[PDB]
Design a protein around this nucleic acid. Structure first.
Ligand SMILES: Nc1ncnc2c1ncn2[C@@H]1O[C@H](COP(=O)(O)OP(=O)(O)OP(O)(O)=S)[C@@H](O)[C@H]1O
Ligand SMILES: Nc1ncnc2c1ncn2[C@@H]1O[C@H](COP(=O)(O)OP(=O)(O)OP(O)(O)=S)[C@@H](O)[C@H]1O
Lengths: 260, 315, 140, 247, 439
DNA sequence: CCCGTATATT
DNA sequence: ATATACGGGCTGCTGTTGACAA
């Protein structure tokens, strides 16, 4: 039975998974501290999540860690099978069991007397990169809100091919540039605003990024309340989000991308 | 850094050692500055793209970044986005001093679909007062007739030995490589027209030997195939099966698949000097043998039987 | 000449007659089921159990409903040899069921389903003063 | 050229841009000695819409004529006119710098091509007939019509009343016979059967812009064949629309 | 010094055109008879203009329209940054046909008659080819002003023109036809001479005028197309160029294969058949079959069918016919699979062509072609209709006696059935197969 | 490819 | 006495990957 997990609010896990859903497959990691689902694409972009043991009520694991690969679309569809619009006062409960290697994943859901049973067979594993972004070589870091860039990143889907990010202590403190068919489009963000919680950039940094790799950050930006931007000496970009649930807990999602 | 095939690229227009007429006319046109749209064709390894890029750079100069468009096959060329971007670039106005115009280059245009070309042919006859085109390709039969019906078609040719030798001598003098006449003749023999191939072969030979003696060139690998089959066909013309099988055995022991040999046999047979009856019968036998080989039964005995059947015809 | 061909469809003797659940939850479940496959199986029990099943080569899903009141059947002498745990399930293509659930906007008080073994499923609804008879052919 | 728009005028400017986009495919910008002029013409040149903006923001021309693809402007002002200030100039590029909340600044550089001066010829004085009414009444009068209609006919019935119909040219479609009363309109100089036939989409854009502050329209229709005129007057905003009539 | 010579020496007046006078007169009389006899009740009409590229179809129409004061309406494809393309096209067509321009500011004002010219057809019209028929039917029903269609076509590869107008809409919609021809050598010669004289009179510097001997070479390798001729003249006058590819006009390629232009065996060192192959001696050939077949732009299995249809009439002996038939059969055998059908296809066509060419010993003796080769037209293979009839009759036999073998075994029984049965549409089928002509 | 015919022009 | 155009014959008979209009 290796790992069994039970919960009464599927929405937390469902929204955490939906915040990272742009590929088709995902890899899990069950450890005494909790699960960790990661995904990679183009051997450059990598997105990971974290669901600590504090959220869970009935969590049981056996011996060492457990790894398996699961289709994300099917799991996300199965989780939200009772409608993604519940009125206040209605909840859904789920139970999941994984009985070791070579056997599928169970999922029993219940709500108001209706009981559903589903199974997802897993064919694992893959290999993941080693994107180590420890806070030792980080040179430029910023922390900022989300409602500022809701429309900004919404006003970012054009027929361009490269997004230019420049950050400097003076003049264009945080400028995004997009070169398309019509013309340039600058979106300068200054300091000392309502969305400037800490500015600590050291030296000027201008870099180019691919639109195709960096596009799926909209889903993480929409379901968030704060965003942290980090870039090191070489020019690798690290994005840290902060999502909350109905109960009042906090979960994190991280994105790693490499420059052109 | 880069290898010798991409580092020794000409930056001017007089370093090109290909044809002599078209290059001189292009230099004159770059001097004047009223070029029409052109379509360049020819064998690979000549320098068509180099000529086009050098002409564009000479025409524009410092304003090349914001007045030039380049499109390739890796970049998507469908219909919608390409026509949109092309019309943006054509309708957009820029300032150019006297007679310089905007340049649109579409490399390997033979890969485009019919829809893209049919949408493109409209933009190439109206905005001619501020823009011009330039196309490079390998097979000129792919481009539709209406597009050719308003372009100047320049056709290149395979390089001869003299220019190849001159530029090879220039490279050797630049790199200070001790040489020998017969070794350079062997390298030119291995080149067979294409020039980047010759430079790559010379670099490979020089890698770990330090000399371009003929023995070193042949030892480090390569060797041209067709001239061996040309003699073999002549041998089977005179009913000499014993002498014919020797070259086949040599090639088979060399490590060549049956299909690769049988294709070259047909290709050499078509452009030969024989009668009509013999050519017909040879084509028939090669066709039957190729069908058998493609069906899966490939071995030495089938090639020997093909040679015997070819020799039987002349008795 | 065609007046006979538009007559009200006949209702044969139902193998099982069962009260229907709330329409909104069934509609949501079916809508989420549409993505996985284009085949569905509906099963009706004699103790008010309604089962919706899909079985693919990768995922298998089954949804259960219980505590559905069985209406008093007219034939009370044909239940001494029929197993209560037996069923007369059928399989249908999930392209016509979803329209029928999506069209409805208010839940009536006469939600009934008549299921037969061979090739027919039939729905009865009545709201205010309007009656609705639904006929969905089987054999997807 | 330098214009600095401040206040709620941004929304009405965006609405005018949307109406022009609903009418035409290209936008002609002309700085006159008395303000700014936005012009648009249909592809077949059967309709012409012009907005003249009385000096209201900072108007100062010369330090002078351009045309632009209209989808770009439409997208920019659909996604960026919901915003407290706007600045327009002509560099050399067209700068559409847009000040926003706090300190966010958005700039938009666009490409333009040289064009000719566009104008038309209309004679409102020469038109005998004349009709005036609030825009809301007309907008309500065109609501029952399906959104797939092409041509509409306006007429005056027997008994001093207005009538709007549906012109159709054996699987036919529905027809409409909407009729109104004289007590809603404010001014009618008409006749005993004079009617005109025109299009609908440009009329719908006109009504859409005219249904904001409850403005009053003015129609000067003439004998069939001659163009019709729709004139909208406001405090600091003038607009004129010219259509064509079936002969 | 800012436009090409193509755009600089455009014909302003009618007399500066490079088209034969009769064609200009024909277009002019059509247009002017429409204008002069413009009845108030006249409906719409469609005119079709064809021709090889670079002959001058658009310019002559524009010049003739400007001479007689006619408004013209163009159609430029709209530029994307929901409505279908066909919807926009029909809306533009209705607006252009119904109403008129307003006043503009400076035009050719005194106008009430106009025509609509459509050249840049949308892609969806090429892919579908069935929306166009409905659009044309609606226009014929509700048309006022004529519609002129301009198409560019080549000798081989004419799929788009026949796909767009497949001989049925023209027949049932009353569409006219006007076809152009490539410019004659003399007209192009005179115009090129005029242009080079104008350049020479410009003076400015000592520039080498292009030689006369290359000037006819420039016009020889262009095949009646003015624009490429002017482009090549501009390129060559900087101090042959312009090798446009040929299409060979498949019906001409068939005649080239089937006529076998031979030589008188000029003294050379070609190999000879030594002792016993004395009946296989042939005169020298001056044609390469591979290039001819490739240049017609046709599949090989179709070329072989056409050759099989048309090769009998040109033969005079029976033994040569036997040899040619054997060669054609052997060419057929090599393409009978499906996985390797496209890997080896050149062999079949080459074998068929060379066998048909060499087997004709009666024709192949140089000066032995006098006299014959009358005015004879070629034809089309008859195998297509027979195969389609075979397939439809296959289905009509199966599904209706389903309880190929039925046609091979049961259908003989049907042929010996001849007795009535209970149906109406089946007696006709019974009488179909079983009533072949026989005395 | 193939044969014979009607019009512009010197 | 020599260059140029009419007349008559063509759209047609299993698998794996890719672009377009909605
Ligand atoms: N005429 C030439 N003179 C000198 N070098 C040449 C010439 N043609 C080709 N080369 C060499 O070829 C190298 C690369 O060839 P390219 O010009 O890129 O070939 P290409 O003209 O693009 O034709 P493709 O792409 O193979 S079809 C250059 O670095 C030159 O050294
Ligand atoms: N005497 C002449 N006759 C015709 N065109 C001329 C002449 N002199 C110069 N030109 C130029 O040649 C152009 C003719 O363009 P063409 O491409 O031949 O017309 P077209 O008939 O539309 O060809 P398509 O559409 O590709 S079949 C004119 O627009 C002029 O710029």
């Amino acid at each position: 039975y290796s790992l069994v997990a039970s919960l009464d609010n599927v929405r937390n896990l469902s929204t955490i998974l939906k915040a990272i859903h742009f590929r088709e497959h995902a890899t899990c990691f069950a450890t005494k501290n909790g699960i960790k689902v990661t995904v990679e694409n183009a051997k450059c972009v990598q997105a990971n999540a974290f669901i600590q043991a504090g959220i869970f009520q009935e969590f049981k694991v056996q011996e060492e860690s457990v790894t398996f690969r699961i289709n994300l679309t099917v799991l996300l569809d199965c989780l939200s099978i009772f409608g993604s619009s519940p009125m206040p006062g209605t909840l859904t409960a789920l139970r999941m069991c994984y009985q070791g290697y070579g056997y599928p994943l169970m999922l029993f859901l219940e709500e108001g007397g209706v009981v559903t049973v589903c199974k997802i067979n897993t064919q694992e594993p893959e290999e993941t990169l080693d994107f180590d972004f420890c806070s030792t070589n980080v040179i430029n870091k910023i922390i900022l809100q989300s409602e500022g860039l809701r429309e900004a990143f919404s006003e970012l889907d054009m027929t361009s091919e490269v997004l230019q990010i420049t950050m400097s202590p003076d003049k264009p403190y945080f400028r995004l540039s997009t070169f398309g068919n019509a013309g340039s489009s600058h979106l300068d963000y200054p300091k000392d605003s309502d969305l400037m919680e800490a500015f600590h950039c050291n030296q000027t940094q201008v870099n180019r990024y691919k639109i195709s790799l960096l596009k799926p950050s909209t889903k993480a930006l929409v379901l968030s309340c704060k965003v942290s931007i980090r870039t090191d000496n070489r020019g690798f970009l690290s994005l840290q989000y902060m999502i909350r649930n109905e109960d009042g807990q906090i979960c994190f999602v991280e994105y790693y991308c490499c420059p052109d | 850094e880069l290898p010798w095939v991409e580092k020794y690229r000409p930056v001017k227009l007089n370093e090109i050692v290909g044809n002599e007429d078209t290059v001189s006319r292009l230099e004159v046109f770059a001097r004047e500055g009223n070029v029409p749209n052109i379509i360049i064709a020819g064998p690979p390894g000549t320098g068509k793209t180099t000529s086009i890029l050098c002409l564009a750079r000479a025409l524009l100069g410092p304003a090349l970044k914001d007045a030039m468009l380049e499109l390739n096959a890796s970049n998507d060329r469908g219909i919608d986005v390409v026509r949109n971007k092309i019309k943006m670039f054509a309708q957009q106005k820029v300032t150019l001093p006297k007679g310089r115009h905007k340049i649109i280059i579409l490399d390997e245009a033979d890969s485009m679909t019919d829809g893209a070309q049919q949408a493109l042919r409209r933009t190439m006859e109206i905005y001619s007062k501020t823009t011009r085109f330039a196309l490079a390709c390998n097979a000129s039969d792919k481009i539709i007739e209406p597009i050719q019906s308003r372009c100047a078609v320049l056709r290149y040719t395979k390089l001869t030995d003299a220019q190849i030798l001159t530029r090879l001598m220039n490279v050797i003098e630049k790199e200070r490589v001790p040489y020998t006449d017969d070794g350079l003749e062997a390298i030119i023999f291995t080149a067979q027209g294409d020039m980047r191939q010759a430079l790559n072969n010379l670099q490979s030979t020089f890698s770990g030997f330090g000399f371009i003696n003929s023995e070193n060139v042949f030892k480090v690998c390569d060797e041209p195939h067709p001239l061996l089959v040309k003699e073999m066909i002549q041998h089977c013309v005179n009913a000499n099966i014993d002498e014919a099988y020797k070259i086949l055995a040599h090639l088979w022991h060399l490590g060549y698949s049956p299909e690769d040999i049988i294709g070259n046999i047909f290709r050499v047979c078509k452009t030969f000097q024989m009668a009509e009856y013999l050519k017909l019968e040879f084509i028939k036998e090669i066709g039957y043998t190729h069908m058998k080989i493609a069906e899966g039964v490939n071995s030495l005995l089938q090639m020997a039987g093909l040679l015997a059947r070819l020799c039987q015809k002349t008795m | 000449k065609l007046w006979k061909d538009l007559q009200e469809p006949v209702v044969p003797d139902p193998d099982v007659s069962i009260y229907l659940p709330v329409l909104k939850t069934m509609k949501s479940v079916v809508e989420k089921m549409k993505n996985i496959s284009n085949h569905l199986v509906i099963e009706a029990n004699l103790d008010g159990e309604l089962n919706l099943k899909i079985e693919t080569e990768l995922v298998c899903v089954t949804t259960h409903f219980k505590d559905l009141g069985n209406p008093p059947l007219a034939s009370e002498s044909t239940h001494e040899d029929r197993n209560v745990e037996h069923m007369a399930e059928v399989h249908i293509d999930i392209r016509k069921l979803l329209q029928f659930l999506a069209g409805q906007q208010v839940n009536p008080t006469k939600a009934l389903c008549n299921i037969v073994n061979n090739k027919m499923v039939h729905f009865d609804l009545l709201h205010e003063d309007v009656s609705l008879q639904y006929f969905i052919p089987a054999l997807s | 050229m330098k214009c600095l728009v401040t206040g709620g005028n941004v929304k009405v400017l965006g609405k005018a841009v949307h109406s022009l986009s609903r009418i035409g495919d290209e936008l002609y910008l002309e700085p006159l000695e008395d303000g700014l002029s936005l012009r648009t013409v249909n592809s077949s040149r059967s309709a012409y819409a012009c907005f003249l903006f009385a000096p209201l923001f900072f108007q100062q021309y010369q330090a002078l004529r351009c045309k632009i693809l209209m989808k770009s402007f439409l997208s920019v002002f659909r996604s960026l006119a919901m915003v407290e200030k706007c600045c327009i100039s002509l560099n050399g590029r067209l700068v559409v710098q847009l000040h926003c909340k706090f300190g966010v600044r958005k700039t938009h550089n666009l490409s333009f091509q040289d064009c000719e001066s566009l104008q038309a010829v209309f004679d409102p004085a020469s038109c005998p007939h004349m009709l005036r009414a609030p825009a809301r009444v007309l907008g309500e009068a065109v609501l029952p019509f399906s959104p797939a209609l092409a041509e509409v006919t306006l007429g005056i019935g027997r008994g001093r009343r207005v009538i709007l119909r549906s012109y159709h040219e054996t699987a036919k479609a529905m027809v409409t016979e909407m009729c109104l009363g004289e007590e809603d309109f404010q001014q009618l100089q008409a006749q005993e059967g004079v009617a005109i036939t025109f299009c609908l989409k440009e009329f719908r854009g006109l009504l859409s812009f005219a249904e904001s502050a409850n403005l009053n329209l003015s129609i000067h229709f003439d004998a069939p064949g001659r163009p019709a005129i729709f004139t909208i007057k406001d405090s600091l905003l003038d607009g004129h629309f010219v259509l064509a009539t079936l002969s | 010094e800012n436009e090409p010579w193509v755009d600089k020496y455009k014909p302003e007046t009618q007399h500066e055109l490079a088209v034969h006078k009769k064609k200009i007169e024909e277009v002019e009389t059509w247009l002017k008879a429409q204008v002069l006899e413009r009845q108030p009740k006249q409906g719409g009409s469609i005119l079709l203009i064809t021709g090889p590229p670079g002959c001058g179809k658009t310019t002559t129409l524009k010049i003739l329209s400007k001479e007689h004061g006619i408004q013209v309406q163009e159609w430029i494809n709209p530029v994307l940054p929901y409505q279908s393309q066909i919807a926009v096209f029909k809306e533009f067509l209705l607006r252009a046909t119904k109403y008129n321009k307003l006043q503009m500011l400076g035009d050719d004002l005194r106008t009430d008659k106009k025509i609509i010219l459509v050249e840049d057809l949308p892609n969806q019209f090429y892919r579908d080819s069935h929306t166009l028929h409905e659009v044309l039917r609606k226009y014929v029903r509700i048309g006022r002003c004529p519609l002129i269609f301009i198409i560019s076509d080549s000798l081989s590869g004419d799929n788009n023109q026949r796909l767009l107008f497949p001989k049925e809409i023209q027949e049932e919609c009353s569409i006219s036809n006007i076809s152009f021809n490539p410019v004659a050598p003399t007209i192009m010669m005179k115009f090129l001479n005029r242009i080079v004289t104008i350049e020479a009179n410009k003076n400015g510097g000592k520039i080498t005028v292009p030689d006369k001997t290359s000037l006819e070479l420039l016009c020889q390798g262009c095949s009646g197309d003015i624009r490429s001729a002017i482009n090549s003249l501009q390129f060559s006058s900087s101090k042959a160029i312009g090798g446009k590819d040929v299409s060979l006009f498949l019906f001409r390629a068939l005649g080239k294969i089937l006529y076998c232009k031979r030589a008188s065996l000029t003294e050379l060192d070609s190999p000879r058949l030594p002792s016993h192959l004395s009946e296989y001696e042939r005169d020298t050939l001056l044609v390469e079959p591979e290039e001819v077949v490739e240049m017609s732009h046709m599949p090989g299995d179709l070329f072989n069918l056409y050759l099989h249809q048309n090769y009998i009439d040109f033969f005079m002996e029976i033994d040569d016919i036997v040899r040619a038939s054997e060669f054609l059969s052997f060419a057929d055998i090599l393409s009978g699979d499906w996985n390797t059908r496209s890997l080896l296809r050149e062999y079949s066509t080459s074998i068929a062509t060379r066998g048909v060419m060499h087997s004709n010993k009666a024709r192949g003796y140089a000066h032995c072609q006098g006299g014959g080769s009358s005015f004879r037209p070629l034809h089309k293979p008859q195998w297509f209709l027979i195969n389609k009839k075979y397939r439809e009759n296959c289905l009509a036999a199966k599904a209706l006696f389903p309880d190929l073998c039925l046609q091979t075994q049961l259908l003989p029984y049907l042929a010996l059935l001849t007795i009535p049965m209970r149906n109406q549409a089946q007696i006709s089928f019974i009488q179909d197969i079983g009533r072949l002509p026989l005395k």
